[PDB]
Structure formats: C-alpha cells, structure tokens
Amino acid sequence: NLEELMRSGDYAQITNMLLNNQPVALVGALPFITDSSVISLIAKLDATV
Amino acid sequence: MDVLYSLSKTLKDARDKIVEGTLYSNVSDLIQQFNQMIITMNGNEFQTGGIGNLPIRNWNFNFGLLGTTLLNLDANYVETARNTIDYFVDFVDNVCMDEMVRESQRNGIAPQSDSLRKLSAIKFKRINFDNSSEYIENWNLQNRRQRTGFTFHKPNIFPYSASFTLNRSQPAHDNLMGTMWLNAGSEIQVAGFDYSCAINAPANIQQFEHIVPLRRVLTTATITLLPDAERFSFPRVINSADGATTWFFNPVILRPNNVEVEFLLNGQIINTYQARFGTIVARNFDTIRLSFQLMRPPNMTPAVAVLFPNAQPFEHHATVGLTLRIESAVCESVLADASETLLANVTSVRQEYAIPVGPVFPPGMNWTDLITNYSPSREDNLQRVFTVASIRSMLIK
Amino acid sequence: MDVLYSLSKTLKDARDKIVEGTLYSNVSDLIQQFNQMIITMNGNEFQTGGIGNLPIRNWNFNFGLLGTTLLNLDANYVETARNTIDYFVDFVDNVCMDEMVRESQRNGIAPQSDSLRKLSAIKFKRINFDNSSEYIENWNLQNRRQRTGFTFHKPNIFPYSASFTLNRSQPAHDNLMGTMWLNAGSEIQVAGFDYSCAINAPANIQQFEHIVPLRRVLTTATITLLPDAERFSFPRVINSADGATTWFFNPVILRPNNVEVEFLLNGQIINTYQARFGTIVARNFDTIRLSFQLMRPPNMTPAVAVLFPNAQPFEHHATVGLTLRIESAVCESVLADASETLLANVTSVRQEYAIPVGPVFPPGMNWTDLITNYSPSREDNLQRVFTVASIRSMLIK
Amino acid sequence: MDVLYSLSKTLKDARDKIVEGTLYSNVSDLIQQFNQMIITMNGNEFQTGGIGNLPIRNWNFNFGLLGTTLLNLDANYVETARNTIDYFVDFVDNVCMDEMVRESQRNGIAPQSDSLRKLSAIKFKRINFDNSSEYIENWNLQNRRQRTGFTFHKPNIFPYSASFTLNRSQPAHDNLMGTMWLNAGSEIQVAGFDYSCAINAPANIQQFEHIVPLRRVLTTATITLLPDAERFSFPRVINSADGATTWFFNPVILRPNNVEVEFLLNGQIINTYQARFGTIVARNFDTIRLSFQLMRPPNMTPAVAVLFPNAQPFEHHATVGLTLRIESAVCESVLADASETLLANVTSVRQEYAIPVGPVFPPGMNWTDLITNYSPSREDNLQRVFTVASIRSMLIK
Amino acid sequence: MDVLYSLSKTLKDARDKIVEGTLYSNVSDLIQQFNQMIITMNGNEFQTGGIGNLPIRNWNFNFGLLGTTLLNLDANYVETARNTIDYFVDFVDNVCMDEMVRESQRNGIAPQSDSLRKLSAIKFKRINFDNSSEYIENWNLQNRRQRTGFTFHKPNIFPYSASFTLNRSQPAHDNLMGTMWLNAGSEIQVAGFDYSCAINAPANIQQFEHIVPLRRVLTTATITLLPDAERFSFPRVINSADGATTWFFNPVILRPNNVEVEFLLNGQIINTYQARFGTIVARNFDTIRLSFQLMRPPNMTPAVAVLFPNAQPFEHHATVGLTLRIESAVCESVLADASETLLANVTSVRQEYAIPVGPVFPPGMNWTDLITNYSPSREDNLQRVFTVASIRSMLIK
Ligand SMILES: [Zn+2]
C-alpha cells in the first residue's frame, strides 16, 4: 500500500526491495507517463523512475 | 543453528509479549527484532522435508512489516501478528523436523537439511538474538571449544546390563559364589552371594568387587548410596551362562561389611567412601568401584545357626547388596534423563514419519545401543539433534 | 486471568528489577508498565473472600505514580516501591486464594470470584504484559483452541489400583493362576503367577496379559521398562475377592519370556517392543498393553527340580513380573507430578480455610478419585485452579 | 552478595546477548549496565584465595568501555567483549570459590572472603542489576525478614537412620515384636512385625506406631504413600541392639490394617489420612506420625493356617509395612535434593583444594551429620554457601 | 466454516427475500451483503471433489453486482438474482459435499477440502454474516472454549446392545436367575427374572441391578420411566452364552418392588427416584443405575399358588421389568436423534458417491460402532461433518 507507506515514513522495505531487486506491486493511485517509443522500450526506462 | 534458535526465541516472545492491550514500551524492542526478521526473510524460498514420509513443503516469505505507532496494542495488530507468527512457526516446525531426522557420519555437527544449510549464511546473520537456553549456550561454547556442562536429573548414563558372575561354580549349582548386578538408568544394584557364607574362606570373610566403567565423565554428582539391594533379595531361578540349565537362588541378607565406594578418573582415586551411606558426592569420575565384603557372623542365635551348616546342603544362601542411584549430575556430553523430553521428541519425529535406519544412530533409536557404543561422531549427531529438539520444544509444545 | 498473570509478573519483576543502586535503563521499561498498572487500578474497589473461613477483605487503590527521573535508583524510590508492591502482592494473593477455592459445574473455565470477574473487563486490559510461563501460555493457546502440551516429570496419570485377578482358582487356593498389579503414580508393577509352573499348559507356556487404559492421551513419553517386579516377589497372605478368606503366595521368580509392550491409541498399535528392556519411548498412546508369558524351564538342576513337582503340593509358586515407570511425558490436559507443587498449593488453600465440598471436586481433593473419573468439566476446573496456583506460586513462595 | 549476583547475571547475559550480527536494540540496555560495571570496577584491586590449596590470585581491572555506535554487532565488538567477559568470569569464579570455602560460627550470613567484604561497599552498589534467580530472591527477602520458600524435588530432609525397635524381645529371639525403619533422603520405609501374629494380643490386633520428627518445617508437600514396604519384606539376619548376637527375620506380609498418617505441627494435627493410599498432600508439618496395626486374619485357607500355629515355633513371621516418599516440598530453609547440584558444587570445591575442617560444617561435608544437627548458624552458613554456589553455577557450567 | 455458513445464509435469504414485487426497504440490507459477497468472490477459482465418484468441478466467479435503484423489485432483477443465486448454490452444494466426505485423524476440527481451506483466509472474511443456527452457534462457542448444548429429541446415546446375564445358571437351564436388557436408541428395557420366584432367597426378595454407562454426559433430560418392560414379557427361546444350546423363557410378570433409579455423575448420586414412575427428570448424569427387586407375594389365590411350587419344575417363571425412555436431552457433544436428519445426509453423501473407508469413521457409517467407541477425534470429525450437513440442509432441501 502506497498510502500507508506515505503515512508511516519508515520505508524500511521498499528501500530493501528496491536495492536488492525484489518483485513487488505498488498499490496506489499514481499518474503515469504514456509513452510511444520503441527506443524508450529498448533503453529500459521504467526501472529508472 | 544460531539463527534457528533466534527465529524460535522471537516467535516465542512474540506469542508472549505481543498481546491485546499491552503497552508499547513493553514490546518496543521486540517489534524491531521481528521487523529485522521479516526484512531478512523476505525474498527467500525454502524447501523442507523429503525423507521418509515427511512431506516436501515449499516456503515463500512475502510479509509486510508490523506497525510501530500504537501506544496500547489493539486487536488489529494482534491478529496480523498472529497470522505472521503462525506462518513462521509452521516454517520453523518443519525446519526442525527436517533437521532432527537427518544425520551424517562425516561431520555431524554441521547442518544437514537444505533449509538450515541455507540459513547458515551471513545474509541471515542479522536474524540473531539472545542465546539464553542451556542447549544453545552449550552449543555456542563448544563452537569455540570451551568447557560446558549439562545438568541432568537422574541421567541415563548406564546401559541396561542385567547379568551375573560366578566366581565359584559347578554343574550341580549347589555351592556358588559371585556377584549379580542391575545397571539401569542411573541405578546400580549389586549383590554378591556366597552359598557357604564364608565357612571355608580365610578369616570367614569373602571379598566382593564390582567395577562399572562409564562412557562419559560425570562431574559433581549427588549419589544416594544405600545398602541391601532390593531386587536381588528374593528367591529366583536363573538360567546359566550358556543358557543350558537353570539354578536356584534362595537369599538371606546380611549387611554389607566394609563398604568401600571409589570414584576413579583415569585410574586415580578421586573420591572414596568407607562405610558411609545416605547421600554422598562424587566430584569428578568416570568409573565407579564398589568393594563390599561378606563376613560370617561369629555369634548366632539358634534361629540363625540352623541356616548355615558346615556341610553341603545350603537351603539359605548368604547375599549382600548395595544400591547406588545418581540423583543429579553435570556431564559435558549430551545424555538422556528423567527430566527432559528431548530424546522422546527425537524418537517421536523419527517414528512418526517412518524413517529408514541411517549410518550413525541405532535402529529404532535404541538408547541402550546408543550409550553402549557412544562414539564421538554419534555424540556430535546426538548433540545437534537434541539442540534442534530443544528449539522445537520451545515453539511446539 | 491474563491480567492477573500480568499483575503478578510485574510485581515479581518489580521485586527483582527495582533494587537499590541499579541503573535506570535496566528498569526504564518496567516502571512504565507499573505506572500503567497504577493508573488503571486507581479508583477501583474490590472484595475478596467470603467462603469457608477465608475472610472478607475490601481493597481500595489510591497510589501515586513512581518517579521517572533518577539515573541510579536510590533507597527512597526503593522504599516507596516496596510499599506499593507489598500492597499489590497482598491484593493478588487474596484474589488467587479467592479464585482457587471456587468452582462451577456449568462452565469452569470462566472466572468464579467477584474480583476476577471484575478484572476480566477491557478497562483492565491495559494492565496486560508478557505471558511467558507455561501455564499462561497453554491458557492462551487453549483460549484459541490450538494444541498444547504440559511437560511432566513422573506424571500421576495412574489412579491407585492395587488388586489382582485369578484366571484359575478354587476355594482350596493351592493351585492358582493369574495376574497381580500395582498402578501407582507413574509406575505399573505387574506379575503373573502360576502355581503349577505350566506343567499342564500347552507347550509348557502360560500367556499373561495386562491392559491399562489411560484417562488422557500421553505424548512423547520416556518409559523405564524393567523386568522382575519387586513388590510381588516376596511371600505374602492376601484376602480373597469377596474378602472372606486369605490365601498364601510364596513366589519364586522366573524371567519374563516373550515380553510384548504395546502402546495403543484408539485401538491401533502405535509403538511395540518385543523383549527390549531399559529405556523405551512411546510417542502417542492412551492404553498400555503388557503381554508377558511364563515358560517352564526345560532343563533344571537338582536344586530347581525339587521346587516344581508334577503332583499337587506346590510350596514354591512360579511368578513373572514387569515394571513400567513413566519418567517424563507431555500431556495436553493438566495433571499432577513429582516436579510441580501446584496440587499441593490448591489442597493447602482448600484445607487451610475449612472449605465445604462443592459439586465438582472430590471431598478432600482426593487425586485418586479425581483421576479415576476425570470429566471434562473437572478438567476445566482443574486447569483454571492450577493456572491460578501457578500465578500465586510466582508471587507467594 | 547482591553485587556478586549482579556481576554474574551481566556476564551471563553478555555471553548470551552480545553475539555476532545481532541488532543493537536487543543489547542497548545491557551494554549500559556492562559499561557501568567497567566504570565501577576500574582502579580497584582484589586478592582471592589463600586457604588450603586454593592459590592466591591478584586481580587488577583496567579496561576500556564498549562501543555504543554499531547497528549490528560485528565480530570486532564480539571479540573485545569476549576478552573482557573472560577476565571478569575468571574473577567471579575465583571470588565464588573463595567464598564457598570459608565459614564462621559467629555470623555466617556475612561475607567471609576479603573480595566479597570489599564488594559489599556502596561504591560497588551501582553494579547492581535484577535479582531474578530463586536463591538471590530468597536472599533478598530474608535480608528484610519476610517469608521465603525453596521448592525442592525429593528433598533430603531425613538423615540416614536404618535401625529397629523390639517392643517384645528375649535372648532366644524366637518371639519378637516391634518396628523397623529406613529413613533415607525423602523416603520412610517402616515395617512393624510380630512373630506370634497377634495370637495373644487383645482382639487379635497389635498396634504399631512410628514418629519421625523433622528438622525444618516443610510446607505444601506432595507425598506418595504406599503400603507394603519393600525393603523389610525378605528374610535377613540382623545384629542385636548391643551388637552381640544376630537374629533371623523371615517375613510374610499382611496388608496394613487401619493406617492413620498424621502430619503434626507443634503437636497439633494439621492433616490426617485414614486408610488412604496413593498421592496425599500435607500442607504444613514438621512431624510425621504413622499409626498402622497388624490384625490376625480370622478366616484362613489351609495354606495359611499352617504358617501361624498357636505354639512357639514360628518359621513365618507376620510383617506389615508402609512407604512414604516426599516427592516435592516447599521449605523455608535450604536443603539438598535430587534436582539441584549445589551441594555437589560446594563439596567439589571443598574437596578439590584440600580444605581443613572448620568450626561449623561436618568433616567431609557429611550431609547426614549436617541435617542430624542442623543448627541456625549452620543454616546461615549453608544458605550463604548455597547462594554463592548458585551464582557460580550460573557462570561456571 | 463461518464464511460457508455465511454464503448459505445469504443464499437462503436471497431466495426468500428477493422476490417479485417486494419493496426495496425489505431487502436493502441484504443486497449490500450479497454485493459484498460478489465483490469478495470475484477473481477466485475453486476445485471441488476428487474422492470416490464425486466428480472434479472447477468454479470460476465472474459476476456483476446487483442493482440498488429499484423501489419495488421487478422481474428482471429477480431473474438475474436467480441466475447468480443458482450458480452460488451449486458451488456451496459441491463444497459441502466435498467437506462432509473427508476426515482426518490428526485434527478433525480443521477444514479438509481444498475449497474450504481456501475459504478460511481473511480475504474471504468480509463474506461473514449472522451465525444464528444452533450448529454454527455451538461451532463459534466451542471455537472459543465455552459451554455448548445441543437439544435432542430422543437422542441415540445408547448403542444397540441386546444381551442378558445369568447370575444363577446350570446346563439344564431349568432354574435360572439374572437380568436381560435391550439398550436401543434412547430406550432401556430391562427385566430381571428368577425361576424359583425367590422361594429360597432371604426374606423372599431377590435384588436385581442394571448399570448403564453413557459415553457423553447428558444434561437436563426428561425421561419416561415405566414399569413392566414389554419386550421381555412373552415366552421365547434364547441361545446360551457360548451359543451352544438354547433355553426356554416362559415369563409371568410381577410388578417391580422397590425401584431405585439413580443418575450417577463421576460416581456421585446426582438424582435418585424411589418407586416413582411416569415422567422423571435427570439434571446431570453419565451413568444410569436401575435397582429393582423381585418379592415373592406372601398371599396368593389358588390360581397363583399353582404357578410357583416349592419343588423344581417351574413352567411359569417370575419376571420383573422396567422401561426408561429419554424423551429429550441437552448434550454438549453431537449425537443423532429422531428429530434431525443430519446423520442421514452424511450417510447419503458417503453412500451415493461410493466412498472408501477412511481412518476415523466406521465402515458404512455404523452409528452403533460410532457411539460404542466415541473417541474425541471422532467427536471432532462428527461435529465438523454435522455442521457442514446442517449448512447444506439449509441450502439443499
Ligand atoms: Zn525425579
């Protein structure tokens, strides 16, 4: 839950699962970048956000 | 092994300390360790079982951390804690049953299951917590080669050995002389008998002797030493040495004259006790030497003088006994006793899942055959499996 | 019940941790729980006693909080702490003696005294602390219907039953056959006797059998199994079945041929042991079946052949015994044993204040009559009163 | 004494809690106490030993404080902690062996060694920590004169006294009457015998009685009371009262008619039990009175009627026994039992270093002679030395 | 289990409350629960069956929510509701038939089917609804270990036991004495007969006795107690005890003199009734003791005096009977009776799909063999399967 993550502020976990590359599903209500590019698909842009 | 005890200690404390309505400062140092445990155990997968009828279970850990923001713990926090604790308790139960069931002749002190070999990394080293139980303390002290001591109440140091010895015998079996004994659990009952009641012995005194070697060196043992061994004091018929014929034993009991109980360590007399009964102490020993003797009574009433003739037919046979019961003792190696249930847990796990007989332990976990030939590799395997049994006995009741 | 254990655990820790000169960081998490306890207990009044000679005492709590501003605890803080602790210890002592004395046939697991019914509210739920003792752990696990285990050293699972059985008998009582037994505490001593020594039995073998049903299912029991039951091995005169006449028993002891000890759970053979003595293990059982047999010795020396004629006058009677002693066992229900003193505390409180016999427990707290008919309502009452006895045994020595 | 327990409790916890890889919040309150200990103990010198073969060792403390800046404890911190802990453990080992070896007739509850007299200052009072073990709790409660209780499993309350009493006797020793007993450990085995089997007693009933005074008042004792004392049930020859001649004892066993077991405190009957066997309870007592009687059986089969003639030659002697075994009891004074090893540690230290016999304790630490004459000065010395033995048994395994 | 009852309660109410033309305020609180059910159950897949001939069915839930915008429910809403309800009713029917068919010796109170193990998560916990039926109320109360009671009309507490007992017998079988009984369902019919009609008994009175132990403790039982057992009052020929020969029984009926019906709980007399017939009450009992006696009539007309001679040929045999019928009783454990059909549903599901005999239940679901050995594991399995049978009996008629 991204809302409870925003509330607590201890992180502790998404820091861990982000540094050590562990699969995860962030439940929130984020806005997104729609992106129409195959070069941006090959360059692997989503791991950088 | 250290991290397995740490997992079980935190799960025990988190069943104990994390309750409904308790203050947060009572559990403020436990929730941080439990969160460190969750953070360490996430992303890892385990596989337990695969020997005998122990089923293969796959373990995957994906849990959220516990909240650190309450003042009094409400029932929401208790229910999510009970969920995470029940999953980890099932995991550590199956890891302990996977570790107690395996053994190795080569190096038994090493972890044998795949899950505990995976937990022995430094990635899992931050799980570690206090090591306060006796078995994990002696594990950590013997992992650095220091002196340890397990305190046992009535230790099963003696293998079951009920037998006898005929110092004087013949195929008629009407004039016999020698000792009989029962070594069982922590109790030695010995009785030397003479059928002639030393009527031709020099100075009417027959010397008996019974030497019990131990397998491990006991230390600071309180021992109840009584005379008049009760089991070898009633009439019985006994098979011979070759098992061919049987012979009759009709005892009358004299008191033991000149009892000398010696506690030998490497052949040196550490403690000695001359005609002192009741509770005695033996500070350091691995051999117990009982030296009692039968003296013919020089003054006898007419009710006694008809029992012991000078001629051959002895219908009443002189018998002199002792009883030696180790009440409590400190031993450096692991044993079984009347207080713990760890051997019972090991045998229950090995018998519940129909486990084949391996290279080290006796078939059916025979403790008599395990303490008869108590090799150091079997000692290492027994200590490892007893430590894991103590861990599971902390979690699983 | 949880808050009563919590009160006693904090009072025990505050007698232990709050001492003179100790550092404040050692007691910084205990003083907050003790202040939460004072804040919760103020303004409330209680009334303990009122049954038998237990006197009615009224309890009023008006205390100030303890200071949180020292670095090393000086003697002022220790003396005011000792005052507040002594008042709360007297309160919890009288609440525990008010709860162990009461019982109910309807729902015994519920609190019966007025003080513990008042403490079972959520106003008092913030008193709650860690639940680390074995009895409060099994209380909390059985309050959620999970598996529990009480570890007993020599459990009193057998009611006192010293009796016999004559498979072959007559009013002359000179040619008898059957078993005798002593079931006491954790020890079964059984002995089958034949006066003819199987001189007319088929293949000179007489089969004996002794089946002991248990009241509760024992789990992971270490059991010392020895041959040659010592109590039924000397001559005695015994009243008959109707108590009319007495008959004489002059035993000579053969060894038990073909011992089969079976541990039955719901009629299914869980563990079996064929001619194996020493320490055995029984993982899960509620019935113990001992099947030993008397075989006439085919080769006998002339000292033995005069004992067993083919004719009628048998002055020496063949007798074969076994001894089975449960050293330690894990039982899901509460029992009594040789290690704890909880039954002694319950009987001491019920006998000190001259308490009338209620609907559930036997008169005089007869443990033989309590384990003879061990109903589940009596089980619930016994577990509740043993838990309160464990709490008071923590506080009151 | 309080600071010695505090030193040992911190060293035990710092061997347990300070391990490699553990989180700092698990040990954040222990490192502050251990640093307070280092700060207090620096600059001080001690001298241990100097009696018997216990060597004189000089102790100087110059240590740096431990770091308070890690998140997970690495192996550097563990190794420097193990160095400081090993030096302090050797120090407290030699202080405990210097204190258990000394005694005083004047005031035994005071510290006798120079090191513990130096530790009894208020400079060392900030070492103090929690006092959670049973012996230091009872030490602190008896230092303020409150009620204490030591819980013993099979306490050694009875001195070894195997003897007899002839209520009816003659130099022929063919028609005797009286009691025999064995008081050993926690077990009383008593047996009253009559050779005539009450053939001339009024109403064919002979009354026996056996009164055992205790040395300290036991409280809440669970007691296994069985009939038919097993040791006095087989034939034996026994020396006379003056030791001149020997007399023969050929028992046949009747059951005990009209058993009355009374538990006397100051001559007042606290508990009484009339013909009830199995497990009994005795809430408060210091005298045990067994009153059993031998009744001649009025109906006897022809196998029994040949045993007991009306005339003089009795080849079969009527014998009636009881067995009383205190399984567990709470005693206010210190004792020895089958559970602890503290007496074994005290005797091991006094026998290892060849210590001369002092003014208080018996030569060789004879527990029979120590509980035979159990004076209050000997009680104070025994409690002090057992408390120090418990401290050393915490540190040294 | 709670969510399965909740699914069935909502489907029952939504077949009942959601009808054509009904007002929306009548169903405004049911449609929200049914929409919560649809929202919870979407996206989940289940698999039912797979044992015996029960076919494997896969369940996938993809449904739209029901409308919340009508004032009176029109037929469109009723038809789409009937579609969704019929799919969920078929699902819960197959889940209940998958759960009643399975059993476990280890922990029978846990769900055994895969679908109900999947429904036991907290994701499905928002399905939960009121628990108003008797079986789910007693399920929820025994899940917290409180007292329960099932009210039965004529409970099948007695196993079928039609047998007899000959207190006086011979191979001629012409002068017999003893009791006969029929224990069936809720009815005990007992009849003691004497062929001599107490012509040589002391005071012409023969005492009979019949003790029926129960398996579970009944509470607040209304019992019709009538004299003159009707089944044992006509002439019949009966096989012997070994089944070798047959003997004839020609009864004439006397009235039962001195009827004493006692209701024993743990050997204590709870209720007693002396010569009172009609409807009686027994508040708490698990043993029924009937003590009636046959008295020879001292005054007899010449039509009666020819029936009972003083000599041997008795062509008319005196017989005295009682009948005891438990009309209704409250039992804490589950049973079968003449009111419910739950045992019939369980046996119909187990016999329809040709299910192999498992480890717990008797072959063919023999209720006589199930109540003969009514173990607590079998009790837990029986309660679980009866609760699921009650759920399916709510949905499926
Ligand atoms: Zn013991």
PDB file of N, CA and C and ligand atoms in Angstrom, chain B residues 153-154 327 338, chain C residues 153-154 327 338, chain D residues 153-154 338, ligand 1:
ATOM      1  N   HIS B 153      18.967 -34.519  35.813  1.00  0.00           N
ATOM      2  CA  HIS B 153      18.303 -35.151  36.948  1.00  0.00           C
ATOM      3  C   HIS B 153      18.061 -36.613  36.601  1.00  0.00           C
ATOM      4  N   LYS B 154      18.763 -37.513  37.307  1.00  0.00           N
ATOM      5  CA  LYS B 154      18.831 -38.955  37.073  1.00  0.00           C
ATOM      6  C   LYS B 154      19.238 -39.265  35.635  1.00  0.00           C
ATOM      7  N   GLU B 327      21.414 -39.170  41.566  1.00  0.00           N
ATOM      8  CA  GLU B 327      20.223 -38.331  41.543  1.00  0.00           C
ATOM      9  C   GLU B 327      20.354 -37.205  40.526  1.00  0.00           C
ATOM     10  N   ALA B 338      15.531 -38.252  33.305  1.00  0.00           N
ATOM     11  CA  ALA B 338      14.133 -38.310  33.683  1.00  0.00           C
ATOM     12  C   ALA B 338      13.463 -36.942  33.693  1.00  0.00           C
TER      13      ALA B 338
ATOM     14  N   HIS C 153       7.312 -34.423  34.803  1.00  0.00           N
ATOM     15  CA  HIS C 153       8.304 -35.374  35.291  1.00  0.00           C
ATOM     16  C   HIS C 153       7.617 -36.313  36.273  1.00  0.00           C
ATOM     17  N   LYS C 154       7.493 -37.591  35.885  1.00  0.00           N
ATOM     18  CA  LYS C 154       6.747 -38.650  36.565  1.00  0.00           C
ATOM     19  C   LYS C 154       5.302 -38.234  36.817  1.00  0.00           C
ATOM     20  N   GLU C 327       8.916 -41.858  33.112  1.00  0.00           N
ATOM     21  CA  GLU C 327       9.799 -40.873  33.725  1.00  0.00           C
ATOM     22  C   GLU C 327       9.344 -39.452  33.414  1.00  0.00           C
ATOM     23  N   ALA C 338       5.686 -35.254  40.160  1.00  0.00           N
ATOM     24  CA  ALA C 338       6.658 -35.157  41.231  1.00  0.00           C
ATOM     25  C   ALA C 338       7.499 -33.891  41.155  1.00  0.00           C
TER      26      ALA C 338
ATOM     27  N   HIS D 153      12.516 -30.856  44.796  1.00  0.00           N
ATOM     28  CA  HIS D 153      12.061 -32.132  44.257  1.00  0.00           C
ATOM     29  C   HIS D 153      12.826 -33.244  44.962  1.00  0.00           C
ATOM     30  N   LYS D 154      12.105 -34.038  45.770  1.00  0.00           N
ATOM     31  CA  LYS D 154      12.615 -35.071  46.672  1.00  0.00           C
ATOM     32  C   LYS D 154      13.679 -34.511  47.610  1.00  0.00           C
ATOM     33  N   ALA D 338      17.231 -33.986  44.906  1.00  0.00           N
ATOM     34  CA  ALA D 338      17.633 -34.722  43.724  1.00  0.00           C
ATOM     35  C   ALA D 338      17.630 -33.869  42.463  1.00  0.00           C
TER      36      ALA D 338
HETATM   37 ZN    ZN F   1      12.765 -37.100  39.569  1.00  0.00          ZN
END
